[PDB]
Design a protein around this ligand. Structure first.
Ligand SMILES: O=P(O)(O)O[C@H]1[C@H](OP(=O)(O)O)[C@@H](OP(=O)(O)O)[C@H](OP(=O)(O)O)[C@@H](OP(=O)(O)O)[C@H]1OP(=O)(O)O
Ligand SMILES: [Mg+2]
Length: 56
RNA sequence: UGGUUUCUCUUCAGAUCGCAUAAAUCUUUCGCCUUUUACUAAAGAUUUCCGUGGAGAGGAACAACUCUGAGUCUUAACCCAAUUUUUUGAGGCCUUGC
């Protein structure tokens, strides 16, 4: 925004440069994918296999 | 002495790259601090995921070929006659050695 709102261009909304935040949130997904695949796999495996009482 | 786009599989590659950058586990300190998660911010040890490269094999061509550029019997007209070279100052004779 400091580079965007420099001269005659004011301080309205008017700024879609979503590439930076887009990269930031996709690099979040890059690492959250194993964690959520493991967590959702255990969720589905407990729902369809049952809970093991004193197994571990 | 002479010819590649795409799909899959296998294998080997991360001591200067993937000129980009996430998460997790352990162990040790921490930092807050009702306890457990969920966390702070460092060191270390390890892993997973999104990507990548080299080689080989096979498939799908929707590219087109062999007097052709380069020959082991064709094909760069120029390495082809005045003192330094591929055109003789040559010619003649005689003695020595088993
Ligand atoms: O109000 P300020 O503290 O001056 O800052 C605001 C705020 O952004 P910050 O997060 O940097 O404060 C606004 O964001 P909101 O949280 O209010 O949504 C933003 O507007 P948008 O983010 O909605 O675009 C706006 O930007 P601007 O007013 O330039 O359009 C920006 O103002 P400043 O840039 O003047 O700080
Ligand atoms: Mg209790």
């Amino acid at each position: 925004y400091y580079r965007f709102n420099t001269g005659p261009v004011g301080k309205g909304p008017g700024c879609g440069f979503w590439a930076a935040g887009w990269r930031v949130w996709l690099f979040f997904m890059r690492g959250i994918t194993p964690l959520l695949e493991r967590w959702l796999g255990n969720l589905l495996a407990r729902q369809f296999e049952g809970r093991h009482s004193k197994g571990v």
